[PDB]
């Protein structure tokens with residue numbers, strides 16, 4: 143009864159998190175005009191954000207494995223909300239202030255995104271964990287899309303680009319108050335372990351890193367998740383320009399309507415993919431214990447041919463291409479929630495924050511330092527799509543390799559929880 147309200151609070155804070163991530167991307171051309179900057183500086187904003195995020199994710203993993211998770215989350219939320227509200231007041235003489243404030247936003251969001259799913263892990267069990275993680279990753283893409291559209295509409299109505307950063311910090315003191323009042327910090331593995339036992343002690347951090355590098359299920363699911371994130375990021379970067387150029391060749395248009403249509407499509411396939419993936423994995427898991435990574439691999443390698451045929455279909459019509467991309471993105475998007483589950487049952491509750499931090503670092507590094515840096519390098523159009531398909535096939539092989547090792551690793555972790563094995 144109280145854990146449902148905790149899940150509602152965490153879903154709301156996740157929606158706010160991605161809203162604050164994308165509210166500056168929904169206002170980008172007026173930023174490019176205000177500070178007198180070219181094309182590279184928007185990529186510099188996003189690069190500073192993701193770099194601070196990746197560098198400060200391991201620190202908050204190490205802190206959330208050993209200290210009060212609710213206090214660190216409250217501090218992170220208060221920090222990024224305060225620095226956003228302060229970043230609203232930057233004059234046009236200094237752009238590096240905007241860069242530094244984006245870095246601090248990245249720090250706070252790294253804190254929250256590293257620590258938050260461990261509470262959902264420690265409050266529920268298998269199927270209910272799967273459904274509440276489904277709600278969490280329902281909250282991410284609606285948050286991103288609504289943040290873009292809210293920044294854009296607030297800038298259009300108010301007339302100043304600064305007001306795009308003034309909408310989100312007002313909904314941040316509410317999240318801090320809710321996280322202080324409603325959420326109560328659960329023990330590390332309260333439902334995976336009886337209450338009469340002494341609490342589990344966190345060992346050294348080097349032992350945590352060696353133990354997280356010695357199990358193959360977690361590493362291979364992280365590599366599959368990395369490949370999926372790379373494929374989706376490159377596709378979202380490439381698709382609107384491709385559809386515009388297709389309508390240029392046909393002659394319909396000699397970036398607003400197609401952009402909003404593709405944004406609606408991305409949001410709807412995100413929520414439908416998370417829902418369908420959790421549903422199929424929960425259905426199949428009872429008759430097959432290795433069904434989560436198999437469903438991940440089926441989603442990835444069954445999304446591959448729909449996108450592969452959309453390029454051939456785009457010459458004839460547009461509606462069939464839209465439909466086929468809508469069908470492929472769902473199978474691309476099951477993997478978020480299913481990979482979050484696969485992480486949260488193969489890792490000891492004294493290592494889940496470090497596992498989330500390592501997964502964040504690996505995924506964001508090999509996806510976002512690679513796609514806008516190598517896709518644009520090899521593009522300047524079919525070899526980029528062939529590289530995308532090769533990475534997708536490698537991710538499918540990684541998810542099958544996860545399916546080989548998921549039983550032994552889940553058993554070893556659940557026996558380590560019960561104290562029957564000692565490291």
Ligand SMILES: CCCCCCCC/C=C\CCCCCCCC(=O)OC[C@@H](O)COP(=O)(O)OCC[N+](C)(C)C
Nearest residue numbers: 167284286287288290291378401402404405406408409
């Ligand atoms: C039981 C229910 C209890 C409470 C219910 C509340 C739950 C959540 C509340 C409200 C959300 C509903 C509104 C629908 C959201 C749809 C999002 C939406 O329509 O977004 C508009 C699109 O334009 C966003 O996509 P873009 O940002 O363009 O794509 C990115 C392009 N890029 C180049 C910048 C990378």
